[PDB]
Amino acid sequence: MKFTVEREHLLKPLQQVSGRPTLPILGNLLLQVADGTLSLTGTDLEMEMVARVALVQPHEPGATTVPARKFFDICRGLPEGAEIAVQLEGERMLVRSGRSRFSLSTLPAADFPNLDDWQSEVEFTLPQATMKRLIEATQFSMAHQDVRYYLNGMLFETEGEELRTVATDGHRLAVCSMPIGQSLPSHSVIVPRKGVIELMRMLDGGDNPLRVQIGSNNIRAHVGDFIFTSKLVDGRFPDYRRVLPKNPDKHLEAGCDLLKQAFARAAILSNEKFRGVRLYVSENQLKITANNPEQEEAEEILDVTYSGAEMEIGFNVSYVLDVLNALKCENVRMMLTDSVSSVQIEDAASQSAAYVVMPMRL
Amino acid sequence: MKFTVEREHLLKPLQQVSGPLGRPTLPILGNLLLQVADGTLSLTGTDLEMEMVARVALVQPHEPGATTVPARKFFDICRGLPEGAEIAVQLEGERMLVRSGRSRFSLSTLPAADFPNLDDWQSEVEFTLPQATMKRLIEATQFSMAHQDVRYYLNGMLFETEGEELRTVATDGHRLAVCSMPIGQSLPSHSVIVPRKGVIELMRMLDGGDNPLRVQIGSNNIRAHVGDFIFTSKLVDGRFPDYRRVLPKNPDKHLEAGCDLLKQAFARAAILSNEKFRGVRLYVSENQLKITANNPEQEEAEEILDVTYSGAEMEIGFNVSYVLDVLNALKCENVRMMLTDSVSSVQIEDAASQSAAYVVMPMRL
Ligand SMILES: Nc1c(CC(=O)O)cccc1C(=O)c1ccc(Br)cc1
Ligand SMILES: [Ca+2]
Ligand SMILES: [Ca+2]
Numbered sequence: 001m002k003f004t005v006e007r008e009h010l011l012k013p014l015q016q017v018s019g020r021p022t023l024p025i026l027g028n029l030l031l032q033v034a035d036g037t038l039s040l041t042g043t044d045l046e047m048e049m050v051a052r053v054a055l056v057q058p059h060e061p062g063a064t065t066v067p068a069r070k071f072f073d074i075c076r077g078l079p080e081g082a083e084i085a086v087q088l089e090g091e092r093m094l095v096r097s098g099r100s101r102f103s104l105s106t107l108p109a110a111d112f113p114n115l116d117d118w119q120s121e122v123e124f125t126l127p128q129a130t131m132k133r134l135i136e137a138t139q140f141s142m143a144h145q146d147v148r149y150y151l152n153g154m155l156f157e158t159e160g161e162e163l164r165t166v167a168t169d170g171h172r173l174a175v176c177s178m179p180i181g182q183s184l185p186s187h188s189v190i191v192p193r194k195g196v197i198e199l200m201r202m203l204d205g206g207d208n209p210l211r212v213q214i215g216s217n218n219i220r221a222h223v224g225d226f227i228f229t230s231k232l233v234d235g236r237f238p239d240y241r242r243v244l245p246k247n248p249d250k251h252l253e254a255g256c257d258l259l260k261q262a263f264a265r266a267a268i269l270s271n272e273k274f275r276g277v278r279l280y281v282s283e284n285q286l287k288i289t290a291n292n293p294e295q296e297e298a299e300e301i302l303d304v305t306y307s308g309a310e311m312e313i314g315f316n317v318s319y320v321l322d323v324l325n326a327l328k329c330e331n332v333r334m335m336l337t338d339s340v341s342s343v344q345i346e347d348a349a350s351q352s353a354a355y356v357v358m359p360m361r362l
Numbered sequence: 363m364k365f366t367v368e369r370e371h372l373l374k375p376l377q378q379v380s381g382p383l384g385r386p387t388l389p390i391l392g393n394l395l396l397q398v399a400d401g402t403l404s405l406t407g408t409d410l411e412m413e414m415v416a417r418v419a420l421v422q423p424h425e426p427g428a429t430t431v432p433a434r435k436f437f438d439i440c441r442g443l444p445e446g447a448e449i450a451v452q453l454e455g456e457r458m459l460v461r462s463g464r465s466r467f468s469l470s471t472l473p474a475a476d477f478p479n480l481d482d483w484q485s486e487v488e489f490t491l492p493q494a495t496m497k498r499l500i501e502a503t504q505f506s507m508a509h510q511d512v513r514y515y516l517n518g519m520l521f522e523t524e525g526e527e528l529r530t531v532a533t534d535g536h537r538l539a540v541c542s543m544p545i546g547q548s549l550p551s552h553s554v555i556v557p558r559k560g561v562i563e564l565m566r567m568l569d570g571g572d573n574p575l576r577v578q579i580g581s582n583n584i585r586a587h588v589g590d591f592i593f594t595s596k597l598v599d600g601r602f603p604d605y606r607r608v609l610p611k612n613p614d615k616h617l618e619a620g621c622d623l624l625k626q627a628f629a630r631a632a633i634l635s636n637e638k639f640r641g642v643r644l645y646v647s648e649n650q651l652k653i654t655a656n657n658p659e660q661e662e663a664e665e666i667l668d669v670t671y672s673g674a675e676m677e678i679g680f681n682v683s684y685v686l687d688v689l690n691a692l693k694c695e696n697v698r699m700m701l702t703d704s705v706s707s708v709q710i711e712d713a714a715s716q717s718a719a720y721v722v723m724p725m726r727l
């Protein structure tokens with residue numbers, strides 16, 4: 001195996017495939033020269049990323065694996081414009097550029113783990129911007145290290161012509177749906193949280209669409225010359241349709257920024273261990289109050305649009321701030337039922353994302 | 363006590379005086395002292411080793427008096443209010459009420475009388491210097507300070523007045539940094555240890571403007587005045603190592619090289635150095651440097667560079683992190699390494715200036 005290529009052509013591929021490993025070979029990249037192509041592959045056993053680089057300078061086929069981070073840091077640390085010559089020499093891989101030389105340890109390409117082969121059952125394309133919107137809208141509501149493993153990822157659901165994401169940790173839920181102009185079978189799978197992250201990282205923001213393939217136990221995404229594949233998570237994800245409040249009859253509209261800053265300020269004098277605030281809803285007015293063990297008190301009064309019965313209801317500050325930060329809105333609609341029931345929250349101008357938040361007792 | 367102030371008149375002062383303060387040992391140490399007197403709001407934060415005081419002119423109606431309130435909470439409130447907001451503040455016994463628009467905050471107080479103050483002390487030396495000079499002096503050496511060493515004095519930074527120069531020295535027992543800058547006045551000879559957190563505060567108060575820095579030093583305190591801020595620290599009582607005895611005696615061998623090429627070569631070689639011991643080898647020959655690294659995985663890096671060097675060949679090992687720290691602190695065009703042999707320290711300087719010197723001990727590889 002032998003190739004020479006510009007540093008410039010390696011940097012993006014290396015960054016993508018490089019994303020303490022539980023087994024040494026999982027800290028290595030698989031390098032393969034075949035035809036006029038260098039392929040680079042990274043994997044953590046649950047997912048993998050493959051990148052391709054065209055070779056025009058003399059090259060020789062073959063394959064090996066080398067330490068990912070070291071190889072990346074070497075390439076990145078060489079000067080702009082550098083040409084990098086690489087050749088496998090028994091147990092080492094020699095990397096040369098200018099009067100810099102590096103000898104890296106190898107592990108056999110034969111050892112490099114592959115995902116058990118699988119079959120695509122559902123396929124579609126969509127714009128990168130759309131996938132980005134869908135993930136960003138809901139990612140923050142995924143569980144972290146919940147024993148209910150299926151909550152640690154994100155539901156991807158096809159229905160009609162829409163792709164939908166759902167995420168929840170049992171206390172708050174996020175759902176976002178976007179049309180993609182293709183008639184789709186109804187289908188639902190759970191992508192693990194590291195997969196969601198990896199998938200976001202491969203989006204750059206061109207009009208070049210993403211190609212998605214979904215199997216019974218895998219998801220694959222192709223964009224540019226990168227191919228990402230992840231295992232899916234087993235289990236029965238919650239049905240957002242049953243989480244949405246049935247009759248959230250009390251509708252309140254507020255400015256998003258004003259609401260956010262009122263929450264943030266009042267939270268300063270909330271309990272540090274469990275930060276929440278009390279909302280008193282009255283005709284065209286919202287009062288937000290916080291109290292702490294030191295008997296300190298914050299109060300914020302806001303003008304809002306609300307006509308309906310008065311009620312007091314408490315919320316975790318972070319849950320509401322997370323939602324407002326995901327909506328990036330001009331005005332927000334809060335749809336309330338009573339003091340002990342979850343609230344539904346949306347951009348006042350769009351129904352494509354919705355958030356459900358359990359109340360907090362204070 | 364009453365005052366009303368525009369958010370931005372109050373905000374940077376609040377930020378600044380909260381500097382010496384996470385989890386305060388006792389509640390008062392988490393508070394700022396507020397004093398309204400003679401048209402001025404004074405704010406003070408302390409950690410018992412040092413104090414930062416800010417004076418804020420009051421152009422709106424006010425009433426004198428003093429209290430203490432939680433620093434972080436008060437700052438976060440003020441920062442969190444809208445740009446240009448008017449902040450009205452009044453002491454009401456056990457609480458201090460802050461009002462702005464339809465935002466209200468009640469903060470718990472502790473008596474001004476309980477706020478600790480540094481003892482009176484007398485200044486024995488005084489001078490003014492440009493902020494940029496103090497910045498230069500500190501940045502040149504701060505990285506060589508020890509970290510939680512039992513020789514407590516190595517955790518601070520030596521400041522020395524001598525001739526027309528102010529000097530800083532820092533060392534952790536393995537490498538040393540020393541930097542001297544002219545300021546234009548003759549000074550009596552003083553040598554004081556500024557505590558770690560003091561160095562950080564001196565740096566924080568440099569606003570990057572043309573307000574000069576005024577320094578006063580006593581036997582057990584240092585004070586710095588910039589604009590409307592006054593910083594005071596106790597000095598560390600200890601026996602700091604003398605740098606003059608650390609500088610290699612007769613470094614006969616002088617190498618010059620481009621700083622950035624040298625840095626980037628070391629940086630790449632470091633990748634394949636021992637993760638704990640970080641050893642690299644330098645081979646010095648006529649107008650050439652070769653840098654090699656290897657690790658327990660039997661991986662190897664080699665870098666060859668053109669340098670200016672005449673005279674006897676030699677080989678010497680160094681901790682590459684210590685070397686990179688020096689090159690990063692020098693930030694210049696060309697560097698001079700002054701060498702003796704494989705068992706002796708190296709002295710490193712900007713080739714174009716003797717104002718900063720660095721001493722790094724060798725490693726047996
Ligand atoms: N059905 C759920 C499961 C699956 C299961 O327990 O078998 C797990 C966690 C939550 C739910 C909810 O119904 C739920 C309710 C309100 C909000 Br806000 C978010 C989720
Ligand atoms: Ca991977
Ligand atoms: Ca929806």
Ligand SMILES: [Ca+2]
Pocket residue numbers: 540541542716717718719
């Ligand atoms: Ca000097």
Ligand SMILES: [Cl-]
Pocket residue numbers: 535536537538608707721722723
């Ligand atoms: Cl030393």
Ligand SMILES: [Cl-]
Pocket residue numbers: 101102103662663664
């Ligand atoms: Cl070599």
